[PDB]
Write a protein that binds this ligand. Structure first.
Ligand code: CHL
Ligand code: CLA
Ligand code: CLA
Ligand code: CLA
Ligand code: CLA
Ligand code: CLA
Ligand code: CLA
Ligand code: CLA
Ligand code: CLA
Ligand SMILES: CC1=C(C/C=C(\C)CCC[C@H](C)CCC[C@H](C)CCCC(C)C)C(=O)c2ccccc2C1=O
Ligand code: SF4
Lengths: 42, 220, 72, 742, 219, 65
């Protein structure tokens, strides 16, 4: 869709998409590996 | 907790240093005002043009750095006084388990140690810490009055005192009395100074009252 | 406790800055390069994002080649 | 005549204007030269009077924007009804609405935040809500999550409906100025149809749904084995057994034999003793009578036929003893300025919100609202803040009218000219009464502090000292305690029990509004309230009147409504704009409403809210310490701020830890605001140019040039963070305290 | 020229150009200046005609199962009122060969094919004779007026070849349709106020007209 | 209802007297066949106001007397 990809390219729409994806990533990581205080995998 | 508050102290020193060094090195001029040396140390601004030049002087940098300085010394002295009042009481474990999170500083230091202070005068009597409770509230009052001069700026006050001058020149039995000095509002840089003076007086008096009353209400 | 996470920070953080810097160099030569700051070229940004995967060697070499510091 | 007056397809629906940002103006639809472009984009985002200089396009824009706001409110309502359906203990609250905390929010167990799901009661772990929505739903006779779910789907339907309506009334078929400028029809419809038939249909709901179901729940009935509302409609024997007045039908109504309808439309004054709310028979009669009233009121103005009034015909023919030759030209400014109407409507809507708070704390209309002290405190606090904010917006938009939409050449008014002429007398006398009020209220507090600190409690201003008794408010309480016996014999009990008498409507181990006494402290704090209100009025009315010209800047209307200053000259003009006056009136509205809600919370926690014993003596939360500690600022610091903020700091544990956290963070953001209010753009621009040097030295220079915030934007960010942090501090404090004690 | 509650503005667009122009527009719905959406003087004419036709079917198909059912001619099972047929499940339900929601999907699909075509003929009248709709689009093309298509399918007989007879028939159509719309309003309000069928209401009013309308809001 | 009663009489007379006060009296497009004005809107207006007066007087009579 022309000019919708330009709107979704705009800084707030793109920032909310990036930070929603990133926050879901961090959230699911903390579900998978909750309560982390060390990196023991070396 | 000592690590964390030492890094808060480092933040305070580095930031006060930043403000002051930036005002000292941008005292002669910057890209926003390269002719600042021609305006002296203390001047209000350079007008709304060029985006806006509020608080551009090196004096203004000093004036903001006094805020960050009082914050820094408040941190170093809160740290000192709580570590030492917990040492003197006996429960160093209190500080060691409570200095790592800020609700420990708000509960176990500011709220806890200020009981005997604010009870310096209650409705059913008073004690020797009544003067420190009164000075505590006095320092609160002037620390808040400085916010009038810092937040509220000129222009509102000149256009208020214009109405007051109208009223004095048109109030019967007070046309008899007339000023010799035309009552203008405070100047801008002056009012930053006056707000900073009320702010610092209140900071200092409040913390003196709290630190003496709490440390003299129990004496360790 | 600190260093194995810390490197894992400086990698990821240095990913970000090496990406957003590289993007800023890739849209530096446009006519009005400010309308790509607020409207991010998703193809260009996606090409630039994984350039910062192995960012440390790129930053190292650009420090040795002098391309890391502008010469004014 | 009042035609339909719309046009087809004025604006093409497309994402082309989604792409180019800041399309709506001349200086923003070019692209960012700097980073000020984005702040000026968001700032002028809804400044429709700046985009297009005609009332037609402006009016279409605000109409469809109101549709978007209505879609948002319907979506929010759908959310609340749905969270009450699937994520709530509403059934368990209905079963025991005295020991089950109203909860309609559950958190996800991810990073330890699951402890915010507290033991609210009813086999449910969640956040105790304070919106009083459960009380509304018991006042509506819901008694099932299916009903909340289906009205949530209905509110989503209405949100989609309002969004489609905004799209239709901007992009596909939009009205023109002949549709908005006619206001006799708008008033007639919003009175007879919105508010008239709205109250009529709510009275119909109550008469047909709320009264029977609430009578069943009050009699004691499990909400599962309670008959549905449609069973009350259809099965006439059932509702007739509830109220035999229904057995006769509407021939009571149409033969005007309404005396037999007094089984379900009573004038039974006071509160329901079984549940602590108002009598829903009284509320049904209320909404019915209000419906008749607004229905006869909405046939007042002339729209299309011969009968009615012209608002122009009223205002231009309203001579009187004090400047009645004026009022001519107000129909012109109000039908050609959205900012005038916005100012007036915001003033009255915020004052109504405050009236709402004051009438909901004292005449609790929902069942089991008065004993959910969190609900009462939160509602009063909320609607007080909303009213103060809306009044300050009335200021902002009065000022924007005065600058932009004010032309003495075309649209002239005698009254507004007379106000602008003697405006210095206005602001001078208001400044004087502000100083007088500050002294003879806060200086009374300071005298009390000094005397109590000097060991002279006999010299304080208290009931055990020099007494400043509110004789007038006490006399009003004495009258209204005795009103229903002589002046209003139709009422068996007074309109409220805050007046006086042997009335204390406890529903369980909780008070729910015993008679509030008025002592010296109430005089003192009411004069503090008059004081803070008068100073807010000073600042705001001063910005309004001096929005155009003054003795300092006689060309301020050419500088704009929202400009920083006119430079350091004339001594300094730093906050001379009307925008700066609303920005300061925001701080003073904050001070005003904060001391108002402090008065409220302490007065109720000391004199009203508490437990009731099996012997018949009430034990309040704080313990009646308002008459002796709320005369000194040290008592507000000690017996109120230090004492009641123990539950927010001996939180960090069970559910209220968030309120603990939101305490400190709010404490922060307020202080974070002080970075903005105290400082100025010049220092931050120079710091930013040093940082820009640091970025140019790494080829990471941005193209959107970093600029420090605009001066006005620094002040806006400051007052914004200041209000947020202070209000969120007070919100955390209030909710933690009152959820942890009552 | 017969005017029933005409106004000063109603005699500015309802001159003679519509079937039934008695000038009755006191509210001012069909004013041509400043129009859009569905408040249009052409769309409102179309809506009058269509609601009148559907109301004629409703009126002579809702009392028909009771005009007959109280005279024989059908089983008493298939002799329900207009509201005890499943269209008000609170008030009544008949069991057909399908449940009522399958029949609603039937109504929706078949009427969708029947009326989206009508709508696209309202937008561009030349259409509905150009796409292969099983060859029966030959009759669905001829429109002239949008509300009076008059093709082999809808107007097989002439019935108004000349404009005088067609005008008189259009007048008869809209007048019988307004009567049927008032009749449907009477059906709804009578079923709401009595809970029985309209033919029961007629028989109760005719035989011994006692408590004709005195039973206000009583079932 | 119950035609002939007091509640009917002092309501009918109020409605008709308001229609008269609008027709030939001090009280006040839509071209009716009426000699002098008094359109359908004016008729409904006088009927509404006469019903207001009628409800008021019948309920003031039912309150006392
Ligand atoms: C891919 C999606 C597609 C959609 C959404 C539609 C939608 C439509 N077509 Mg359609 N068509 C579609 C593909 C095609 N059509 C056609 C050829 C036609 C013709 C010839 C006609 C339609 C008509 C219709 C309408 C009636 C359907 C209905 O009653 O809803 C039913 C929905 C329910 C029962 C859901 C429950 C409620 C509707 C606008 C009719 C019309 O426009 O009037 C009509 O005459 N279509 C072809 C062949 C070229 C298609 C090829 O893919
Ligand atoms: C700046 C100060 C600071 C620091 C150092 C930390 C540090 C931490 N916090 Mg705290 N926190 C902070 C501020 C801070 N927080 C603030 C401000 C808040 C309030 C908003 C919180 C609120 C908070 C909560 C509520 C919780 C934490 C938790 C944690 C831990 C995170 C565990 C985790 O999920 O990471 C795991 C690691 C990641 C998410 C990073 C993954 C990155 C991706 C997958 C890429 C990595 C791979 C990459 C491709 C490279 C591979 C190499 C090669 C093959 C290419 C950690 C000890 C959590 C915890 O366990 O408590 C101790 C927890 O529950 N914090
Ligand atoms: C998807 C359908 C659609 C499309 C393509 C358009 C397209 C357009 N509209 Mg229309 N509009 C629509 C739906 C649509 N509109 C609806 C549903 C409404 C009713 C609210 C309107 C009301 C409307 C008005 C009143 C105006 C336009 C205008 C415009 C043009 C400019 C759009 C722009 O830059 O703003 C893009 C803006 C956004 C995408 C922001 C969305 C804001 C939504 C409504 C509220 C969201 C708030 C959120 C819940 C709260 C914030 C939370 C956050 C902090 C997390 C453009 C031609 C303008 C125009 O042409 O005049 C010159 C104009 O003045 N539109
Ligand atoms: C004012 C509107 C409003 C607000 C603030 C919330 C807020 C919330 N909802 Mg609710 N919700 C709403 C409207 C609202 N909802 C409506 C209108 C619906 C109907 C579609 C729902 C249906 C709904 C469901 C089904 C669920 C929530 C859930 C949630 C929570 C997490 C949502 C999340 O992280 O999404 C993820 C983020 C994005 C989609 C972005 C949060 C408390 C969840 C919850 O409470 O979990 C226990 C959950 O399961 N909501
Ligand atoms: C008796 C009819 C009637 C009713 C009920 C309303 C009701 C309303 N109008 Mg008003 N309006 C009317 C006639 C009416 N109007 C007329 C005749 C005009 C022209 C003079 C206007 C001009 C007007 C303007 C210019 C604005 C409003 C606004 C509003 C809304 C204010 C928000 C509110 O209180 O939310 C309460 C919310 C509800 C009751 C929910 C609404 C749900 C229903 C579906 C809509 C109400 C009926 C509506 C008239 C639509 C009729 C059907 C439609 C298909 C034609 C409110 C819904 C303002 C608004 O919010 O903008 C959208 C606004 O800006 N109206
Ligand atoms: C009916 C309510 C109403 C309406 C319709 C308007 C409409 C308008 N106002 Mg008015 N205003 C209102 C209420 C209202 N206001 C109130 C209650 C106040 C008192 C605070 C003001 C104070 C006010 C001022 C002082 C000014 C306006 C201005 C404007 C115009 C442009 C606003 C704009 O583009 O910002 C678009 C929206 C934003 C920029 C967003 C604002 C962000 C808010 C402040 C943050 C708070 C959000 C939340 C509570 C905090 C948590 C957030 C979370 C994410 C962390 C527009 C005509 C301006 C104007 O006309 O100047 C020419 C202007 O200068 N208004
Ligand atoms: C506690 C802090 C504080 C105090 C005391 C004041 C005091 C005042 N403000 Mg300010 N203001 C403040 C904070 C404060 N402000 C902040 C933070 C803002 C941020 C926006 C503002 C913004 C602001 C505006 C915008 C306005 C005011 C106004 C006022 C005055 C109204 C009350 C008055 O004169 O009554 C009498 C004085 C007081 C109540 C002040 C306290 C004095 C007490 C009662 C005792 C005095 C003792 C006595 C004189 C003995 C002195 C000692 C002796 C040795 C000489 C007063 C000068 C208004 C004004 O000036 O016009 C009337 C006005 O328009 N203020
Ligand atoms: C238009 C319209 C619609 C939607 C209906 C719909 C219906 N009619 Mg009615 N009907 C109509 C016109 C209409 N009719 C006309 C014009 C006549 C003549 C009738 C005479 C009629 C009779 C005599 C009966 C129905 C019945 C029915 C129902 C069953 C239909 C079926 O089995 O297939 C259904 C509610 C039957 C019923 O009540 O079930 C039934 O017995 N209709
Ligand atoms: C001339 C006949 C007549 C009589 C005898 C009465 C007598 C009465 N009226 Mg009625 N009334 C009248 C005409 C009359 N009214 C008219 C013309 C109107 C305007 C529509 C009203 C509107 C009216 C209202 C709105 C109320 C009364 C009420 C009352 C009662 C108490 C008045 C009061 O304040 O104490 C009293 C029995 C009050 C009452 O309590 O009645 C129960 C009341 O609320 N009357
Ligand atoms: C702190 C301060 C500033 C500096 C404040 C800055 C410039 C505004 C804050 C801007 C934010 C931090 C920009 C970054 C947000 C971008 C959208 C980038 C997002 C990308 C990542 C960071 C997520 C002023 O300019 C100022 C002006 C006048 C009076 C007082 C003050 C004042 O107190
Ligand atoms: S607001 Fe005051 S300090 Fe800022 S530019 Fe204007 S005159 Fe100078």
């Amino acid at each position: 869709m022309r000019d919708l990809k330009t709107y979704l390219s705009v800084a707030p729409v793109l920032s909310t998409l990036w930070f929603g994806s990133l926050a879901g990533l961090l959230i699911e990581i903390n579900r998978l590996f909750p309560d982390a205080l060390t990196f023991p995998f070396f | 907790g000592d690590f964390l508050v030492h890094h808060a102290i480092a933040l305070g020193l580095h930031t006060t240093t930043l403000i002051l060094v930036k005002g000292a090195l941008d005292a002669r001029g910057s890209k926003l005002m390269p002719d600042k040396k021609d305006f002296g140390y203390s001047f209000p601004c350079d007008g709304p043009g060029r985006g806006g030049t509020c608080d551009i002087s090196a004096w203004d940098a000093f004036y903001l750095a006094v805020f960050w300085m009082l914050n820094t010394i408040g941190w170093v002295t809160f740290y000192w006084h709580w570590k030492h009042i917990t040492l003197w009481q006996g429960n160093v474990s209190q500080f060691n388990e409570s200095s790592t999170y800020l609700m420990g500083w708000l509960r176990d230091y500011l709220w806890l140690n200020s009981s005997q202070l604010i009870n310096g005068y209650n409705p059913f009597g008073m004690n020797s810490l009544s003067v420190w409770a009164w000075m505590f509230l006095f320092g609160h009052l002037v620390w808040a009055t400085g916010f009038m001069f810092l937040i509220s700026w000129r222009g509102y006050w000149q256009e208020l005192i214009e109405t007051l001058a109208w009223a004095h020149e048109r109030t019967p039995l007070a046309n008899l009395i007339r000023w010799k000095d035309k009552p203008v509002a405070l100047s801008i840089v002056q009012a930053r100074l006056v707000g900073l003076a009320h702010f610092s007086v209140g900071y200092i008096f409040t913390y003196a009252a709290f630190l003496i009353a709490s440390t003299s209400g129990k004496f360790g | 406790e600190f260093i194995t996470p810390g490197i894992l920070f400086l990698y990821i953080a240095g990913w970000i800055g090496w990406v957003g810097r590289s993007y800023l160099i890739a849209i530096s030569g446009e006519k009005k390069p400010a309308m790509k700051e607020i409207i991010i070229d998703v193809p260009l940004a996606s090409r630039i994002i994984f350039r910062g995967f192995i960012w440390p060697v790129a930053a190292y070499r650009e420090f040795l080649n002098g391309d890391l510091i502008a010469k004014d | 005549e009042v035609k339909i007056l719309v046009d087809r397809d004025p604006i093409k629906t497309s994402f082309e204007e989604w792409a180019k940002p800041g399309h709506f103006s001349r200086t923003i639809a070019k692209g960012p030269d700097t980073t000020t472009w984005i702040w000026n984009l968001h700032a002028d985002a809804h400044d429709f009077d700046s985009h297009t200089s005609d009332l037609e396009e402006i009016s279409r824009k605000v109409f469809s924007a109101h549709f978007g706001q209505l879609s948002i409110i319907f979506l929010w309502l759908s959310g609340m009804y749905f969270h009450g359906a699937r994520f709530s203990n509403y059934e368990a609250w209905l079963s025991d609405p005295t020991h089950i905390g109203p909860s309609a929010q559950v958190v996800w167990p991810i990073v330890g935040q699951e402890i915010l799901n507290g033991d609210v009661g009813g086999g449910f772990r969640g956040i105790q809500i304070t919106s009083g929505f459960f009380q509304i739903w018991r006042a509506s006779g819901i008694t099932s999550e299916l009903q909340l779910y289906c009205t949530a789907i209905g509110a989503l339907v209405f949100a989609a409906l309002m969004l489609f309506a905004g799209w239709f009334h901007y992009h596909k078929a939009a009205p023109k100025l002949a549709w908005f400028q006619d206001v006799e029809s708008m008033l007639n419809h919003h009175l007879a149809g919105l508010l008239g038939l709205g109250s009529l249909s709510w009275a119909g709901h109550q008469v047909h749904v709320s009264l029977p179901i609430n009578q069943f729940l009050n009699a004691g009935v499990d909400p599962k084995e309670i008959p549905l509302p449609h069973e009350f409609i259809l099965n006439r024997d059932l509702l007739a057994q509830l109220y035999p007045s229904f057995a006769e039908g509407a021939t009571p109504f149409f033969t005007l034999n309404w005396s037999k309808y007094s089984e379900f439309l009573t004038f039974r004054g006071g509160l329901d003793p079984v549940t602590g709310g108002l009598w829903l028979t009284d509320i049904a009669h209320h909404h019915l009578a209000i419906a008749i009233l607004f229905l006869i009121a909405g046939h007042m103005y002339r729209t299309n036929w011969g009968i009615g009034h012209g608002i122009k015909d009223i205002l231009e023919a309203h001579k009187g003893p004090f400047t009645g030759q004026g009022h001519k030209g107000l129909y012109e400014i109000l039908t050609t300025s959205w900012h005038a109407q916005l100012s007036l409507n915001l003033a009255m809507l915020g004052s109504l919100t405050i009236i709402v708070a004051h009438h909901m704390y004292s005449m609790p209309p929902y069942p089991y609202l008065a004993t959910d002290y969190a609900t009462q405190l939160s509602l009063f606090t909320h609607h007080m803040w909303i009213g103060g904010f809306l009044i300050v917006g009335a200021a902002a938009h009065a000022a924007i009218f005065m600058v932009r939409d004010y032309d003495p050449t075309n649209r002239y008014n005698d009254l507004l000219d007379r106000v602008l002429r003697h405006r210095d007398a206005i602001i001078s006398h208001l400044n004087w009464v502000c100083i007088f009020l500050g002294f003879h209220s806060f200086g009374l507090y300071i005298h009390n502090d000094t005397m109590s600190a000097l060991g002279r409690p006999q010299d304080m201003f208290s009931d055990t000292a020099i007494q400043l008794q509110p004789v007038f408010a006490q006399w009003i309480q004495n009258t209204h305690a005795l009103a229903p016996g002589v002046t209003a014999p139709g009422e068996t009990a007074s309109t409220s029990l805050t007046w006086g008498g042997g009335e204390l409507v406890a529903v369980g181990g909780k008070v729910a509004l015993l008679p509030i006494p008025l002592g010296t402290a109430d005089f003192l704090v009411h004069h503090i309230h008059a004081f803070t209100i008068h100073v807010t009025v000073l600042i705001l009315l001063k910005g309004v009147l001096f929005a155009r010209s003054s003795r300092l800047i006689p060309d301020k209307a050419n500088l704009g409504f929202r400009f920083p200053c006119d430079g350091p000259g004339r001594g300094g003009t730093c906050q001379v704009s009307a925008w700066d006056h609303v920005f300061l009136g925001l701080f003073w509205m904050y001070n005003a409403i904060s001391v108002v809600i402090f008065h409220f919370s302490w007065k109720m926690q000391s004199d009203v809210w508490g437990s009731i014993s099996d012997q018949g003596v009430v034990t309040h939360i704080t313990g009646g310490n308002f008459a002796q500690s709320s005369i000194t600022i040290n008592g507000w610091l000690r017996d109120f701020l230090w004492a009641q903020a123990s539950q927010v700091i001996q939180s960090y544990g069970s559910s209220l830890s968030a309120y603990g956290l939101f305490f400190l963070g709010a404490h922060f953001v307020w202080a974070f605001s002080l970075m903005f209010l105290f400082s100025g753009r010049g220092y931050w621009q120079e710091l930013i140019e040093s940082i820009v040097w640091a970025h140019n030295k790494l080829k990471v220079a941005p193209a959107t040039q970093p600029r420090a915030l605009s001066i006005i934007q620094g002040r806006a960010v400051g007052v914004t963070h200041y209000l947020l942090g202070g209000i969120a501090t007070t919100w955390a404090f209030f909710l933690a305290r009152i959820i942890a004690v009552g | 020229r017969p005017l029933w509650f005409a106004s000063s503005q109603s005699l500015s667009y309802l001159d003679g150009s519509l079937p039934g122009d008695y000038g009755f527009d006191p509210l001012g719905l069909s004013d041509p200046e400043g129009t859009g959406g569905f408040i249009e003087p052409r769309w409102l004419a179309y809506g009058e005609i269509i609601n009148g036709r559907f109301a004629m079917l409703g009126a002579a198909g809702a009392i028909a199962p009771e005009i007959l059912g109280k005279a024989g001619l059908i089983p008493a099972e298939t002799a329900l009122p207009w509201f005890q047929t499943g269209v008000i499940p609170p008030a009544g339900t008949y069991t057909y060969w399908a449940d009522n929601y399958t029949l609603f999907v039937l109504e929706m699909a078949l009427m969708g094919f029947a009326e989206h075509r009508r709508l696209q003929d309202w937008y561009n009248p030349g259409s509905m004779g150009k796409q292969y709709f099983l060859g029966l689009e030959k009759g669905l093309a001829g429109s002239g007026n949008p509300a009076y298509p008059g093709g082999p399918f809808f107007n097989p007989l002439g019935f108004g070849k000349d404009e005088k007879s067609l005008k008189e028939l259009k007048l008869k159509e809209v007048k019988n349709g307004r009567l049927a719309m008032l009749a449907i309003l009477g059906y709804f309000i009578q079923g709401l106020v009595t809970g029985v069928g309209p033919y029961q209401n007629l028989l109760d009013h005719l035989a011994d007209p006692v408590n004709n309308n005195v039973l206000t809001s009583l079932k | 209802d119950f035609i002939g009663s007091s509640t009917n009489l002092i309501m009918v007379t109020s409605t008709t007297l308001m229609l008269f006060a609008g027709r030939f009296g001090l009280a006040p497009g839509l071209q009716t066949g009426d000699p002098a004005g008094f359109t359908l809107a004016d008729t409904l207006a006088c009927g509404t106001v006469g019903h207001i007066i009628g409800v008021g007087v019948v309920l003031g009579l039912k309150n006392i007397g």
